[PDB]
Amino acid sequence: HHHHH
Amino acid sequence: MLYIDEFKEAIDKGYILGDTVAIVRKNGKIFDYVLPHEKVRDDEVVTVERVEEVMVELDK
Amino acid sequence: MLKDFGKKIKSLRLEKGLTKEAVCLDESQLSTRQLTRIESGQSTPTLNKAVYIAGRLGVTLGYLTD
């Protein structure tokens, strides 16, 4: 979802 | 040009956080957004706008 | 489909000795920021941007699709 996750 | 899907993706991926976002307009039309780490050139006109109001305007 | 679009357009741009700014020309259709986001995969390419970029790099869009 959120970047780097 | 800014697609509603592009804006929504930037929110979904956590690049556009919070209630407001920096917007570049050209010829009266929303042209782009600007993230905190990005640069703008001197001739680009930047306004701080409400995310939900940008969404309304793009959805039209 | 355009999932690998960013990597391919970056390769082709660098091949041709072009900066992102040169691809974007007067930035009336594409900002340097938007091209950067596409190349890194930050932003999914939309149709108008993908076709504009393909034309700027001298190829049909089919050269750049998955």
Residue numbers in the entry:
A (entry chain C): 64 to 68
B (entry chain A): 1 to 60
C (entry chain B): 1 to 66
Publication passage describing the model:
Within S. pyogenes, Prx functions to inhibit the quorum-sensing receptor-signal pair ComRS, the master regulator of natural competence, or the ability to uptake endogenous DNA. ComR is a quorum-sensing receptor and a transcription factor that belongs to the Rgg subgroup of the RRNPP protein family, many of which regulate virulence in pathogenic Streptococcus species. ComR is a monomer that contains a DNA-binding domain (DBD) packed against a tetratricopeptide repeat (TPR) domain. Specifically, Prx binds directly to the apo-form of ComR preventing DNA binding in vitro and acts as a repressor of the S. pyogenes competence regulon in vivo.
Despite not being able to obtain an X-ray crystal structure of Prx in complex with full-length ComR, we were able to cocrystallize Prx with the DBD of ComR. DBD:Prx cocrystals were obtained with both purified minimal DBD bound to Prx and after in situ proteolysis with full-length ComR complexed with Prx. The crystals grew in similar conditions and both diffracted to 1.65 Å and 1.60 Å, respectively. The obtained complexes are nearly identical except for differences in space group (P212121 and P41212) and their cloning and protease digestion artifacts. Analysis of the DBD:Prx complex interface reveals that Prx directly interacts with the DNA-binding surface of ComR. The interaction is highly electrostatic in nature, with Prx using a large negative surface consisting of conserved acidic residues to complement the conserved positive DNA-interaction face of the ComR DBD. Specifically, Prx utilizes D32 to make hydrogen bonds with both the essential arginine residues R33 and R37 in ComR that are responsible for DNA recognition. Furthermore, residue D32 is the focal point for a stabilized hydrogen bonding network that positions Prx E44 to make a salt-bridge with ComR R33, Prx D38 to salt-bridge with ComR R37 and for the arginine side chains to be further stabilized by hydrogen bond interactions with the Prx mainchain. This binding network is extended across the full face of the DBD:Prx interaction by Prx E6 making a hydrogen bond with the invariable ComR residue K49 and Prx E9 providing a mainchain hydrogen bond with ComR T44. If the DBD:Prx complex is aligned to apo-ComR using the DBD, we observed that Prx is unable to interact with the DNA-binding residues of ComR due to a large steric clash as this surface is held tightly against the TPR domain.
